[PDB]
């Protein structure tokens, strides 16, 4: 197991995690926008 | 200071930052859930 194999697997872990963190952010942005609409409606 | 030392230190910075961004997300998810409960309670 080379340094390059370790670097590659770290990069892969990071990219997978970034996609999951973005999806979580989008879910929460929808929830917050729904709350803002509830508190802002006439 | 090699290219590999730079790559390693960048990867390390990124992984530390990802753990901190996740912790911030969890704190905010708790705060948003508390707001949702306040606005949803009977």
């Amino acid at each position, epitope marked *: 197991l080379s340094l390059l194999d*370790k670097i590659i697997g770290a990069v892969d*872990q990071i990219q997978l995690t970034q996609a*999951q963190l973005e999806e979580r952010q989008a879910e929460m942005e929808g929830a917050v926008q729904s709350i803002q609409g509830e508190l802002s409606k006439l | 200071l090699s290219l590999l030392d730079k790559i390693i230190g960048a990867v390390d910075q990124i*992984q*530390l930052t990802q753990a*901190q961004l996740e912790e911030r997300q969890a704190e905010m998810e708790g705060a948003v859930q508390s707001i949702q409960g306040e606005l949803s309670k009977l």
Partner: nanobody
Amino acid sequence: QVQLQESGGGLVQAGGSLRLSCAVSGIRVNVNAMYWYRQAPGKQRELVAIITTFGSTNYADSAKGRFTISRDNTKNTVYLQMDNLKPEDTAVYYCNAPQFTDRYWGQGTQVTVSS
């Protein structure tokens, strides 16, 4: 699949020490950053400690210098040494890799600290 087998929890007195272990299969701990989490009853999962691929560490503020994360590459095992334990550390402790926290959690290991 990835297998996560946590052990080393139990019942400990305040001021005591534990060393948790997570035996990992399906990914290499010397390739992947690895995290320890804890979850107290009815509370949100809290990140406790992280070790990066190249061995840098970070801790939650609740650890405040008491916890040390480490690994054994040959045993493909991640460890969390916990010193000067407090009742507030009572929780189930879990090890994971960040890319799988949306996917699978092991059974965890129960840590109970009593005064």
